[PDB]
């Protein structure tokens, strides 16, 4: 009611008007007036303990492994940037698009190939996060990206 | 078969036209005419227009016979009011409502 465009004039006298008393038309009791406890820009972030983020990361990968859904690959053979090249490779490693994959690799080329698949979330090892590990059904990493994962939960 | 007419937005007070309409509901088209011609009411003129229009609809459009027409149903609905300012003493403004009417007459055929 202080940030609203109206004036601060009392609309009519306090007494003897036969009407209810009011001040200015900015008061939240009026149509078009201010908002009593409406939102204001907020910072929803907060500092989660690092060990909670390291345990959770390890634990998310652990969950997938205990399901037999974690698959480490040494390299992506024909994949040189083309989507048809990743699908070809995909079928060879048993990934037939009936399961959500989190492709985790520092290979710029291989991530270009698998970007557009509606069943692949694509990611670099530095970005490994549990929300993306858990929202996908299977997990696939480089031996290079797996080495990087081992550092972070060390 | 039925023939209907509707005069929408007649600038007259619904409560006032109804008095005239109540005279003719259920009367035959011939009595309804004589009754309307000697009703001492502004509303008579508007009802007569709607009545003769409904009768024209019957004969012309719906293959009904003038000699057998009666006023099977009629009613007056209230339409949107014209709101006007009426000045009073000591600086006060009153809102006159110039009300409006939707007059309806439905004729049927009184066989036999």
């Amino acid at each position: 009611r202080g940030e609203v465009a109206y004036s601060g004039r009392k609309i009519w006298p306090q007494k003897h008007t036969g009407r209810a008393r009011h001040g200015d038309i900015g008061a939240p009791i009026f149509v078009g007036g201010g908002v009593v406890f409406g939102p204001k820009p907020r910072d929803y972030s907060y500092t989660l303990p690092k060990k909670v983020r390291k345990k959770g990361l390890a634990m998310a990968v652990a969950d997938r492994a205990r399901e037999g859904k974690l698959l480490l690959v040494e390299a992506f053979a024909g994949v040189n940037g083309k989507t048809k090249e990743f699908l070809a490779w995909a079928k060879e490693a048993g990934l037939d698009g009936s399961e959500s994959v989190l492709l985790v690799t520092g290979n710029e080329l291989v991530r270009r190939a698998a970007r557009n698949l509606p069943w692949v979330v694509t990611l670099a090892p530095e970005g490994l996060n549990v929300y993306d590990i858990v929202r996908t059904e299977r997990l696939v990493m480089d031996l290079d990206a797996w080495e990087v994962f081992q550092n972070r939960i060390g | 078969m039925e023939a209907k007419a509707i005069a929408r937005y007649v600038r007259i007070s619904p409560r006032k036209v109804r008095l005239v309409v109540d005279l003719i509901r259920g009367k035959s088209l011939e009595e309804a005419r004589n009754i309307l011609r000697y009703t001492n009411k502004r509303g008579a003129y508007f009802v007569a227009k709607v009545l003769e229009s409904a009768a024209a609809n019957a004969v012309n459009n719906h293959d009904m016979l003038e000699d057998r027409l009666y006023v099977k149903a009629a009613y007056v609905d209230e339409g949107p009011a014209l709101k006007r300012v009426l000045p009073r003493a000591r600086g006060r403004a009153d809102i006159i409502k110039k009300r409006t009417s939707h007059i309806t007459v439905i004729l049927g055929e009184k066989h036999g």
């Binding site: 609309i11 009519w12 006298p13 003897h16 008007t17 036969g18 | 600086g91 006060r92």
Partner: peptide, 14 residues
Amino acid sequence: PTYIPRPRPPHPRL
């Protein structure tokens, strides 16, 4: 809300 007609004075109940 144009003009505020001031109300009549009360009966003096003193």
